[PDB]
Amino acid sequence: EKDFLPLYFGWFLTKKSSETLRKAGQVFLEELGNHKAFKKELRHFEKLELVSYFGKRPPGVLQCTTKFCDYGKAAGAEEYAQQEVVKRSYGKAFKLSISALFVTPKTAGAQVVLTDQELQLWPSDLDKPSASEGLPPGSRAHVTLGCAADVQPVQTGLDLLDILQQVKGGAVGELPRGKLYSLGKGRWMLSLTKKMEVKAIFTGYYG
Ligand SMILES: [Cl-]
């Protein structure tokens, strides 16, 4: 009998960090929903409460996934899990840097900017999203804050990749914690003046 892998590996925020980032996310959603520029462009996306719009919020603690394994059914799962760095890092505490919050018609999330140490724990898979073309490794790294009723949480990273592609290719408001950008097609990013730092434990989730 072989051993099951986790459902996924990743960085699981401490309860305090999780609560801090959730609160920040919610404040962002309330501020964006109330912003003139958002309300004006509501056609591409009475007023909309975005906390309600993103009705599926993650359970438990917030987390940033490295490798989704599906207990070993996902491509590259065993290959990822067998790495020394993964084993050595299992249970270890990290600090994650969050540089921006974003919204799309599908998801709400936080952009994680990995250290190169943390990048050692990022997977190197054969199948990459076409939206990840020409972006630095680990660009997909995110914390999902919410999504629409008919959307899967994994969409949040795809949405992030798409936003970063737009930013790579080359400002409608000033919020207290950063500058607000309208990227078109219902996409919005808050670029934080100060990166947000959260504490997290790298480990595996089985459910
Ligand atoms: Cl929480």
Residue numbers in the entry: 161 to 205, 213 to 337, 342 to 378
Pull text from the paper.
Mutation of active-site histidine residues (H230Q, H230S, H309Q, H309S, and H230Q/H309Q double mutant) abolishes CNPase activity. Overall, the structures of H230S, H309S, H230Q, H309Q, and H230Q/H309Q are highly similar.
CNPase consists of an N-terminal polynucleotide kinase-like domain10, a catalytic phosphodiesterase domain11, and a membrane-anchored C-terminal tail, which contains a cysteine residue that undergoes isoprenylation. The catalytic domain enables the rapid hydrolysis of nucleoside 2′,3′-cyclic phosphates to nucleoside 2′-phosphates. The CNPase catalytic site, lying in a groove between two lobes, has pseudo two-fold symmetry and contains two apposing His-X-Thr-X (X denotes a hydrophobic residue) motifs, characteristic for 2H phosphoesterases 113537.
